[PDB]
Design a protein around this ligand. Structure first.
Ligand SMILES: CCCCCCCC/C=C/CCCCCCCC(=O)OC[C@H](COP(=O)(O)OCC[N+](C)(C)C)OC(=O)CCCCCCC/C=C/CCCCCCCC
Ligand SMILES: *[C@@H]1O[C@H](CO)[C@@H](O[C@@H]2O[C@H](CO)[C@@H](O)[C@H](O)[C@H]2NC(C)=O)[C@H](O)[C@H]1NC(C)=O
Ligand SMILES: *[C@@H]1O[C@H](CO)[C@@H](O)[C@H](O)[C@H]1NC(C)=O
Ligand code: ALF
Lengths: 815, 324
């Protein structure tokens, strides 16, 4: 119980009226953001690899490991800082607004954040209440004011509130010189329809009166005075302790299922890299245990290498193997993912099918990091008023039908009343004449003892002992509060678990009379289910912000309720019907493109590095690179970079028109299907097989005196060049075989990558370069191309490597 | 209203090929009918190559060359006896081969100064640190520096055909035209400081394992210094620990006589190169060439095998499709 003095006059110390929704300040932004970014395993590993390349050893420059890491870190920091600065601007708009305080018999113009608990606040018509106020008096003689609470429950209907009867006569300067009172009220809580308090109006008769206070006397922050000229109230709860602030949660970091799969793949490949390095180091020191294996007469060490401590040399050799094989974790993949996420998001904003003539606006992209999440939705939590209705929206029922045909569950979370919400659900055809409604409301339940009986009955004798379309669930806010506040101190007989069990096999769930935090709580409950369903919430009001921030991807509607939902959402669309195109076509395409990009990046880098690992068994495990340093540098920059980027931005494995007309195709990629264990193992074993084929085909080709008609001999650089040529052609042709949607851009990048590989090989190996310290590749490529047997071997190895893919193509397209 | 362009509306004209069993099945027959004859051709071409390999390491006591493993007199000579059962008809190529020699070791591969080997005046007097501990000797730079240069193979191999009167007929060997044209003529160059080579290497010293300096490798001025072809052939490091290096060319005669007639031959060996300290072996290889190079059955066998597998799988799929 908190005690509030009406005019801060004798007849505690609370927070101020300032609201905060940002997470950074100016001074701590860089430390906090860098600490959060480098707490991630990928960034930490990239930093460690860059440091090792700088300090110990590297086959290429440390620049090619430091610059991409800096780029990724800087891009992420800029995005997060801009979003937090937008939150700062919104907080500054909410604060700094003009409020009027009756300080000493006079109206004092102050700032909204400067309101104290226990001061008289004057609010005029059409003005939002700056804090939680107890209504003391109005202009009218009946002490009644009308209020709209659209920002709290999403409804435009007027609500009636009553002033304190002993203070209804206090107007003008009579509210300070004739008002000495104290209010005893509860601690702040988010219920939004429950208030317990008592006011003690002291007078000169020494006989103070006591009047109980209820929610009818409380003017909540965010509500608007309507049709009342002027009211007088006293602050009882101030910013971060008002019910609006207590129904706000704040956004946790949102990570896609594709990002989580990227993290898992990175962990697997980190284990692979460490295993390769450890095997190479162990075999190197077993090999060097022969005194002519280490330091033969023709390959002698310097004095420094001989006088280098053995343990330090072992550690350094392990690090050298690590940097030799580090390419199997590509930072170019992260760079390309950032680029593809940024560039591909423009299709949503360009899409003319999202353009609405009434508001002269199309779709809005706030985050480009969740494009692939639009193709993985499992649950849709929709607001009712202004989202499903305008009378429904243009194609609300048809959109719900398409979402059902896509395999999605649609639940309605509304701050509106049960009867109107249920009528809308019948109009939207979420509930049919055949649907049997199970009602967990205040009509069917009057105490917490009957609630458990209802839950048990809907479990064990109605629904589990069964016809999925047979049942629908209706629950109101108070019963949900009972469930969420009375299911503690238990794990097995969890009534929250029983409620979720009832919900999961109902054809639809209606949650009515919701508070803003309760929608987020429902979304969170669904998010914690077994199997980790992906959640989408959509709404048009400021009371949908909490569930929009809570869900995996939040959709704001550009309607008449303002722009708070749109500004806090990941994506914004004018109409609810646009969700069909946003998910079925855009999200499907985004998921398929990025999943293929991730798998292809890992596969092509394993194909790149495995022959280099195999080459250690034929040198002295000496960390000798199989390829030239320029080839190592531009494998991912110039030779195999653009085709996958063009694929991930243009590929339509299924046409957009087909994707829009067939919602059932959404279920093919339903549970992160393209990045599961099966596909991952397929890609990994294909890469391993192809790398083995590369290296050992070249090895068996080199079991001859000459591959030329002039009898001349090739060396280690030609060996590596042949392996690299087969590798580049194989990975490019694998992507080409995977391609189903060939634009002129795709033709250009795919064929020009190979043409540029040949042209660069000729140009780089054409001129004795006067600025490098070695000429190891002067005519290696040109000499290799003079060998007919080398051409034939390259062609045969390319065909052998692509044979499993061709065989899979012919098998999967028969019977 | 948004921009209704084909790129922005994701409706660019595309090809959209279809890959099905019925349209890809004939490739499993075309590939077979192309690969099998090519594989047979490669296999037949590789079988007609005439090759002989003679090991002269001398590790076994019964070897004409055990007396050269640990010698007393400096120049140890050994002759080995071998027979050519069939005449070598075309151009013949003489190779020496080394086993268990890691020319691909990382410390070995970097032990060179390519600016010095390209005839750069500053690099001639200041060889790179990468070619150490073979960089300086007696307070002078080493003119060819590095381990690769220092370890240059230096055995002398000559061939004699035993005539009808027991008189050995020497087979003429050519030391030119064995290296890559571009690394003889561009990559490897000599210092430009005049015309006499002994003066152009004024402030340098020879490799420590060298007997004579780099300007006494040959009397022919086009094969003398850094452009000596034996030196260049050695300096192009090998890919695998067992390798071959082109040594001499035995050109076919202007007449239609065999280049190496069948009979009895001698192998004059001046044993200078030790390999038994690291368990290596030394071979001499005589071989003929073709369009495919030397003798290697791998390419022909692999082409035949892949073509046959492709054809068999195509037949299996075609029979499956005709079950109806
Ligand atoms: C004819 C038609 C077909 C085409 C023919 C081919 C022609 C050639 C054209 C290709 C060029 C296209 C470029 C596409 C991107 C490829 C590069 C990339 O994406 O690959 C990152 C690369 C390679 O990485 P890797 O995996 O090989 O690992 C490094 C290996 N290791 C770790 C062992 C050292 O690495 C790097 O060199 C970094 C380069 C990438 C950019 C990141 C660096 C930017 C600098 C940072 C500044 C900060 C900016 C922050 C944001 C400011 C706001 C705008
Ligand atoms: C042939 O090559 C061998 C191997 O390099 C040379 O042997 C070295 O000779 C130098 C100089 O006498 C000695 O200091 C080294 O100890 C020798 N090394 C070995 C492993 O024996 C030999 O001198 C060369 N003979 C020539 C040039 O005819
Ligand atoms: C090598 O030189 C002569 C030259 O005819 C050859 O006959 C002999 O067998 C070999 N050894 C020596 C030096 O006697
Ligand atoms: F409009 Al609502 F829940 F905010 F139906």
């Amino acid at each position: 119980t908190r005690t509030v003095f009406v005019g801060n006059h004798p007849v505690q110390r609370f927070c101020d009226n300032r609201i905060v929704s940002s997470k950074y300040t100016l001074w701590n932004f860089l430390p906090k953001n860098l600490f959060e970014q480098f707490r991630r395993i990928a960034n930490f590993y990239f930093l460690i690899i860059f440091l090792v390349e700088v300090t110990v050893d590297t086959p290429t420059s440390p620049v090619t490991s430091g610059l991409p890491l800096f780029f990724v870190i800087t891009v992420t920091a800029i995005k997060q800082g801009y979003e937090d600065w937008l939150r700062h601007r919104a907080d500054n708009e909410v604060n700094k607004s003009t409020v009027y305080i009756i300080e000493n018999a006079k109206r004092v113009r102050k700032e909204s954040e400067k309101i104290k608990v226990g001061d008289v606040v004057e609010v005029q018509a059409d003005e939002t209440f700056p804090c939680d106020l107890i209504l003391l008096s109005s202009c009218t003689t009946d002490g009644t004011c009308y209020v709209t609470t659209a920002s709290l429950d999403g409804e435009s209907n007027c609500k009636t509130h009553y002033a304190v009867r002993d203070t209804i006569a206090l107007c003008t300067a009579e509210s300070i010189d004739t008002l000495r009172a104290a209010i005893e009220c509860e601690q702040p809580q988010p219920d939004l329809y429950k208030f317990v308090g008592r006011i003690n109006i002291y007078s000169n008769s020494l006989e103070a009166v006591a009047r109980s206070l209820g929610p009818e006397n409380l003017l909540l922050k965010g509500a608007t005075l309507k049709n009342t000229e002027k009211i007088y109230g006293v602050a009882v709860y101030t910013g971060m302790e008002t019910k609006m602030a207590l129904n706000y949660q704040g956004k946790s970091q949102k990570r896609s299922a594709v990002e989580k799969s990227i993290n898992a793949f990175l962990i697997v490949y980190l284990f692979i890299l460490l295993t390769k390095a450890a095997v190479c180091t162990t075999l190197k020191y077993v090999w060097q245990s022969t005194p002519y294996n280490d330091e033969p007469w023709y390959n002698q060490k310097t004095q420094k290498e001989r006088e280098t401590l053995k343990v330090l040399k072992m550690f350094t050799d392990f690090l050298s193997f690590m940097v030799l094989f580090n390419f199997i974790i590509p930072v170019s993949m992260y760079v390309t993912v950032e680029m593809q996420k940024f560039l591909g998001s423009f299709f949503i904003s360009w899409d003319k099918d999202f353009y609405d003539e009434e508001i002269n606006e199309g779709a809005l992209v706030n985050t480009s990091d969740l494009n692939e999440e639009l193709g993985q939705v499992d649950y849709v939590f929709t607001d009712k008023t202004g989202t499903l209705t305008e009378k429904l929206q243009d194609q609300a029922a048809e959109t719900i039908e398409a979402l059902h045909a896509a395999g999605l569950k649609v639940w309605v979370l509304t701050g509106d009343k049960m009867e109107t919400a249920k009528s809308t659900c019948y109009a939207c055809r979420l509930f049919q004449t055949n649907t049997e409604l199970l009602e967990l409301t205040t009509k069917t339940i009057e105490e917490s003892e009957r609630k458990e009986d209802r839950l048990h009955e809907l479990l064990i004798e109605y629904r589990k002992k069964l016809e999925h379309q047979e049942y629908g669930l209706i629950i109101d806010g108070s019963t949900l509060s009972l469930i969420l506040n009375s299911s503690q101190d238990s794990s097995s007989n969890n009534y929250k678990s029983i409620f979720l069990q009832i919900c999961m096999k109902c054809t639809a769930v209606l949650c009515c009379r919701m508070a803003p935090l309760q929608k987020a709580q429902i979304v969170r409950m669904v998010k914690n289910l077994k199997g980790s369903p992906i959640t989408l919430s959509i709404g048009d009001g400021a009371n949908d912000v909490s569930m929009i921030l809570e869900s995996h991807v939040g959709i704001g509607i550009k309607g008449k309720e303002g722009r708070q939902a749109a500004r806090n959402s990941d994506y914004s669309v004018p109409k609810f019907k646009h969700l069909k195109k946003l998910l079925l076509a855009h999200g499907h395409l985004y998921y398929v493109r990025i999943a293929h990009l991730v798998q292809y990046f890992f596969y092509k880098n394993l194909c790149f590095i495995l022959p280099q690992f195999l080459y250690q068994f034929f040198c002295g495990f000496s960390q000798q690179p199989l390829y030239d340093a320029a080839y190592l540098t531009m494998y991912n920059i110039c030779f195999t970079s653009l085709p996958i980027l063009a694929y991930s931005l243009l590929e339509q494995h299924i046409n957009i028109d087909t994707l829009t007309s067939d919602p059932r195709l959404y279920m093919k990629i339903s549970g992160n299907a393209m990045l599961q264990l099966g596909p991952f193992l397929y890609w990994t074993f294909l890469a391993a097989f192809e790398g083995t084929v590369f290296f050992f085909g070249t090895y068996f080709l080199f079991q001859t005196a000459s591959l030329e008609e002039n009898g001349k001999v090739y060396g280690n650089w030609t060996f590596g060049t042949i392996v690299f040529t087969v590798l580049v052609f194989t990975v490019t042709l694998k992507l080409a075989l995977d391609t189903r949607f060939w634009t002129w851009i795709n033709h250009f990048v795919i064929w020009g990558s190979l043409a540029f590989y040949v042209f660069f090989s000729f140009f780089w190996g054409g001129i004795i370069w006067p600025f490098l310290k070695q000429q190891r590749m002067y005519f290696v490529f040109a000499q290799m191309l003079s060998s007919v047997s080398t051409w034939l071997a390259i062609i045969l190895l390319i065909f052998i490597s692509l044979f499993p893919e061709i065989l899979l193509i012919v098998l999967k397209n028969v019977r | 209203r948004p921009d209704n362009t084909a790129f922005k509306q994701q409706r660019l004209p595309a090809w959209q090929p279809i890959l099905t069993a019925g349209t890809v099945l004939p490739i499993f027959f075309i590939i077979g009918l192309i690969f099998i004859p090519i594989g047979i051709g490669i296999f037949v071409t590789s079988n007609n190559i005439r090759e002989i390999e003679i090991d002269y390491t001398g590790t076994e006591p019964s070897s004409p060359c055990n007396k050269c493993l640990s010698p007393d007199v400096t120049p140890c000579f050994c002759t080995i006896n071998f027979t050519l059962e069939k005449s070598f008809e075309g151009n013949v190529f003489m190779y020496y081969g080394l086993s268990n020699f890691y020319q691909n070791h990382r410390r070995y591969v970097k032990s060179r100064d390519d600016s010095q080997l390209n005839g750069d005046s500053s690099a001639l007097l200041n060889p790179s640190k990468e070619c150490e501990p073979y960089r300086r000797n007696e307070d002078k730079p080493i003119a060819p520096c590095g381990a690769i240069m220092n370890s240059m193979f230096n055995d002398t191999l000559e061939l004699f055909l035993i005539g009808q009167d027991s008189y050995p007929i020497p087979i003429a060997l050519k030391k030119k035209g064995i290296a890559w044209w571009t690394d003889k003529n561009v990559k490897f160059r000599n210092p430009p400081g005049g015309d006499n080579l002994e003066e152009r290497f004024k402030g340098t010293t020879k490799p420590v394992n060298w007997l004579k300096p780099v300007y006494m490798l040959d009397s022919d001025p086009d094969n003398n210094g850094f452009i000596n072809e034996d030196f260049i052939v050695w300096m192009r490091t090998a890919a695998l620990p067992t390798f071959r290096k082109l040594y001499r060319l035995i050109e076919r005669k202007s007449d239609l006589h065999p280049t190496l007639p069948a009979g009895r031959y001698w192998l004059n060996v001046t044993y200078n190169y030790p390999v038994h300290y690291f368990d290596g072996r030394k071979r001499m290889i005589l071989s003929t060439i073709s369009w495919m190079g030397g003798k290697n059955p791998f390419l022909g066998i692999a082409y035949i095998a892949v073509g046959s597998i492709s054809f068999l799988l195509g037949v299996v799929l075609l029979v499956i499709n005709h079950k109806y």
